[PDB]
Swiss-Prot record:
The protein's role, per its UniProt record: Functions as an inhibitor of the host RNA interference antiviral response. Inhibits the insect host cell apoptotic response initiated by the viral infection. Blocks as well the activity of members of the caspase family of proteases. Required for late and very late gene expression.
Keywords: Apoptosis, Early protein, Host-virus interaction, Inhibition of host caspases by virus, Inhibition of host innate immune response by virus, Modulation of host cell apoptosis by virus, Protease inhibitor, Suppressor of RNA silencing, Thiol protease inhibitor, Viral immunoevasion
Name of the featured protein: Early 35 kDa protein
Family label: Belongs to the protease inhibitor I50 (p35) family.
GO biological processes: negative regulation of apoptotic process; symbiont-mediated suppression of host apoptosis; symbiont-mediated suppression of host RNAi-mediated antiviral immune response
Length: 274
C-alpha cells in the first residue's frame, strides 16, 4: 500500500575561482533533531575557507541535475582551521594531524563521548587516511539547534591542493564487508577517468523487481556513459535502476548516481581539475 520517499545524500561540488571551489554537502544525518551532538567526516582536496549555510531548499535543486541526466537512460512503464557558529562546529586539518590528535579535536568540538570516539576513531578514520598524501579531512559536528530553520544545507568554500577534487563517497568500515550507497552528485571542472568509473560501476549490485526473468546489464556508451541497469520484458522492454556515472564532455560535467546499490568497494571518487 504505503508509498515511500527516500532521505538519501546530495553532493554538488563546483569550481568558482581559478583557485577556489565550493562544495555543498546535504546528508541524511542533517535531517534529524536532537540525538545529542552528531558527527560527520569527509575528505576535501584542499583547505576550507568558509562553511556557509544555504536554504533547506538548495537540496532538491541540485539533486535534479543528474536524476535528470539518468532519467533519460531508463525506460519505465597543515593547521586546524576552525569554523564555529550557533549550532555546528567544523574543523579542517590534515589526516596525519587528525590521526595524531583525533581525540582532543572532537573534544574541542564539544563531542567528547567515549565509546563513540573509540568507534569513529576505529571504523572511520582508517578510511579517510592514506599513504600517497595527506588529504584534508572535514570534521563536522552538527549540534542540537541545528534542527531549527530552513537553512540546513552546508557549503564549504575551499581551494584544492595539487589539481585534484575528491567526491566523499566512502562510508565507515562494517563487519559484513558490504556498503549500501544512496548518493547523487554534480561535479564540474574535472577530467574524465574511464578507468576508475569502470572499476566502481562494475562492482555494483542493483536492486530487483523480483521479475525472475530480469537481467542486469553493464554499459560503457562513450559524453561518456558508464552504468549498470536492470532490464526485463512485460512488448515492453523495461530498463530501470540505471546507476553509475554520466560525463558531459561538452560542459565537462559529471553526474553520479549511486542510489540504493550495494558494493564491496568503499572509496571516494578522486579527480583532476582542468
Amino acid at each position: 500500500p504505503v508509498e515511500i520517499d527516500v532521505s538519501q545524500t546530495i553532493i554538488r561540488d563546483c569550481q568558482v575561482d581559478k583557485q577556489t571551489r565550493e562544495l555543498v554537502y546535504i546528508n541524511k544525518i542533517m535531517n534529524t533533531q536532537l540525538t545529542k551532538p552528531v558527527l560527520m567526516m569527509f575528505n576535501i582536496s584542499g583547505p576550507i575557507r568558509s562553511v556557509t549555510r544555504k536554504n533547506n531548499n538548495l537540496r532538491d535543486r541540485i539533486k535534479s541535475k543528474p536524476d535528470e541526466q539518468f532519467d533519460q537512460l531508463e525506460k519505465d512503464y597543515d593547521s586546524i582551521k576552525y569554523f564555529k557558529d550557533e549550532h555546528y562546529s567544523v574543523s579542517c586539518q590534515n589526516g596525519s594531524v587528525l590521526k595524531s590528535k583525533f581525540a582532543k579535536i572532537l573534544k574541542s568540538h564539544d563531542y567528547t563521548d567515549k565509546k563513540s570516539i573509540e568507534a569513529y576513531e576505529k571504523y572511520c578514520l582508517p578510511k579517510l587516511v592514506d599513504e600517497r598524501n595527506d588529504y584534508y579531512v572535514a570534521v563536522c559536528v552538527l549540534k542540537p539547534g541545528f534542527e531549527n530553520g530552513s537553512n540546513q544545507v552546508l557549503s564549504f568554500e575551499y581551494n584544492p591542493i595539487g589539481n585534484k577534487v575528491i567526491v566523499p563517497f566512502a562510508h565507515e568500515i562494517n563487519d559484513t564487508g558490504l556498503y549500501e550507497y544512496d548518493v547523487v552528485a554534480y561535479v564540474d571542472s574535472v577530467q574524465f577517468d574511464g578507468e576508475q568509473f569502470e572499476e566502481f560501476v562494475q562492482s555494483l549490485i542493483l536492486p530487483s523487481s523480483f521479475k525472475n526473468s530480469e537481467k542486469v546489464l553493464y554499459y560503457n556508451e562513450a559524453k561518456s556513459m558508464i552504468y549498470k541497469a536492470l532490464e526485463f520484458t512485460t512488448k515492453y522492454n523495461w530498463k530501470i535502476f540505471c546507476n553509475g556515472f554520466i560525463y558531459d564532455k561538452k560542459s565537462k560535467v559529471l553526474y553520479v548516481k549511486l542510489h540504493n546499490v550495494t558494493s564491496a568497494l568503499n572509496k571516494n571518487v578522486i579527480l583532476n581539475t582542468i
